[PDB]
Write a protein that binds this ligand. Structure first.
Ligand SMILES: O=C(O)CCc1nn2c3ccccc3n(CC(=O)O)c2nc1=O
Ligand SMILES: O=C(O)CCc1nn2c3ccccc3n(CC(=O)O)c2nc1=O
Ligand SMILES: [Zn+2]
Ligand SMILES: [Zn+2]
Lengths: 325, 323
């Protein structure tokens, strides 16, 4: 009974000329940001719609390369780090000790943005834009990612070796307000747009896979229930990031394109539901890149919250997903 | 059938200058005209001979095709190469002379070391190549037909990479010729339709070994008939070009199973022979350039190579063992 899923995927495409006009404003923001000494080498990372149900909301990431870093891990959190330096730092005014202050460099970031309005941050009638700034280190990835990104049986060890030569990024997130969180935003995009074991996956009629459709249906399912139960607040800590990482673990578990054939959209999606449910019950959802970081730990999400989402998802599947209508 | 063939590949594995190049890259970078200069085995039977190409990015180039040759171009344009201008043309004649001058005076500082060929105790051949980060020229539009093999997605990615121009006489002595040897390497080392080709026992393919055997067979015939000199104009580049066309014809990894090495190599030999007889071997990247036209290679030279190759294939390739 995948015809209901196929219909949903067609309506989600309906709500997709949606348009590129924040690329004007982001271009004008990027001009005066380079005029400052601290943000000279800042360029755009990639639109990127976090919410697949709100095409009128975008998200862009601004990257600034840092020349010389020695990273310092906060406690055993393995995802949050202190950024310490090894010429003349243009971010020397953001130094609180040996630690580049996240808060300091963010404050300057919003100031110049609030100075271009008269001509992290979210910008205004029916469109919004979420802006994030990230450090770029072209160095080797930290030791916590050594066992992550298990794509060797799927996209090959050769591709994993090439992806890990690319730079990694750090975004400002509290852990304590002096920490930076690892981010591989660029890698998840590259993998999803180059997702088959076959290099010609989805390029011909004989190799049509349903990986991308399963991810979309997964994100739509969570957003729909997040708005259905928007009052209880039990679902507020659940985001499409959790759904994406679970989908990537499923791709690792099912590496052949034979296991994602478009005919089997029903079972593929159902197996994506099931793995997500299993992570909820056992309270275990490892970061795809940082395998010892548990997104579904009791420290970050309450068990009662996961039990409510499990109950609702199981209800939806048992009744042919009325959430989609 | 692959018994003798695999025994030949096992010998070629057993048979497998850094400093000299590094000391040359520094004293060359000291010159203004060659400020941006960086790094980027031609023979399988001569492992005491290496091959290296030095790249130098030229910022903004305006190419002009020389008389519908599709491969040779004049390069027109704070310019560090204005010393080598002969009007508005970057004269390859003057560019390659200043190149040899710095090297010839630098191998004086290893005290015996004698485009340019170095002799050590071992031989190294150095080539100079301008790099343009622009889009590839129009003569290349229909080349690199890898869409059914390595995917159109990959073809557009490789097409975003820079191309290179090498000083080669066309004779007009200041023309530059297109070069994509960097693309050839990436295709050869990432060669399957499946990204895990040759990464497990289930997906073992015989593409790389098929090309090695074709290069070996050519290099051996060259040594065998080196006196008569009919085979001097042939080279590994012709063999590699025919191989890439066979990869385009046979895009599935199942048509290259390691079990079928005998059939695959015989098919690779057969297509190369077809290129010889019909005198047609398109450049893989510039399809309108025929490497086997009678302008470049004598037809009797191709008929001599055909006769020799056809004898070897009919007699289980005896030339693989004689030397
Ligand atoms: O991938 C990106 O760059 C942004 C998306 C994203 N990454 N991310 C984490 C990455 C590492 C560790 C914890 C992380 N958390 C914790 C959370 O879910 O709050 C988190 N949430 C996110 O939304
Ligand atoms: O750098 C590269 O592209 C590979 C090396 C290489 N390229 N190349 C040619 C490229 C275009 C036209 C003719 C070409 N010929 C033979 C010839 O001049 O007829 C040739 N021999 C070579 O060894
Ligand atoms: Zn696909
Ligand atoms: Zn292979």
């Amino acid at each position: 009974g995948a015809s209901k899923l196929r219909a949903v995927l067609e309506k989600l495409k309906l709500s997709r000329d949606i348009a590129g006009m924040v690329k004007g404003v982001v271009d004008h923001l990027l001009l005066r940001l380079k005029c400052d000494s601290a943000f000279r080498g800042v360029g755009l990372l990639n639109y990127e719609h976090v919410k697949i149900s709100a095409p009128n909301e975008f998200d862009v990431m601004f990257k600034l390369e840092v020349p010389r870093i020695q990273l310092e891990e906060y406690s055993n959190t393995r995802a949050y780090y202190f950024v310490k330096f090894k010429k003349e730092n243009p971010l020397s005014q953001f130094l609180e000790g040996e630690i580049l202050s996240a808060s300091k460099m963010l404050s300057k970031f919003r100031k110049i943005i609030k100075e271009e309005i008269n001509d992290a941050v979210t910008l205004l009638e029916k469109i919004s834009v979420d802006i994030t700034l990230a450090l770029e280190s072209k160095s080797s990835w930290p030791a916590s990612t050594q066992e992550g990104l298990r794509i060797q049986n799927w996209l090959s060890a050769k591709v994993r070796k090439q992806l890990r030569l690319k730079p990694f990024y750090l975004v400002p997130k509290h852990a304590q307000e002096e920490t930076w969180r690892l981010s591989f935003s660029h890698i998840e995009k590259e993998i999803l747009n180059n997702h088959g074991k076959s290099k010609t996956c989805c390029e011909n009629k004989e190799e049509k896979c349903c990986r991308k459709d399963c991810l979309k249906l997964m994100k739509y399912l969570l957003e729909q229930l997040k708005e259905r139960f928007k009052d209880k607040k039990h679902l507020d800590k659940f985001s499409s990031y959790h759904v994406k990482t679970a989908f990537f673990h499923v791709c690792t578990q099912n590496p052949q394109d034979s296991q994602w054939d478009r005919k089997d959209l029903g079972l593929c999606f159902d197996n994506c539901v099931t793995y997500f449910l299993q992570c909820l019950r056992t309270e275990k959802l490892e970061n795809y890149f940082i395998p010892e970081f548990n997104l579904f730990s009791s420290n970050l999400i309450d068990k009662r919250s996961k039990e409510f989402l499990t109950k609702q998802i199981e209800y939806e599947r048992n009744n042919e997903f009325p959430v989609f209508d």
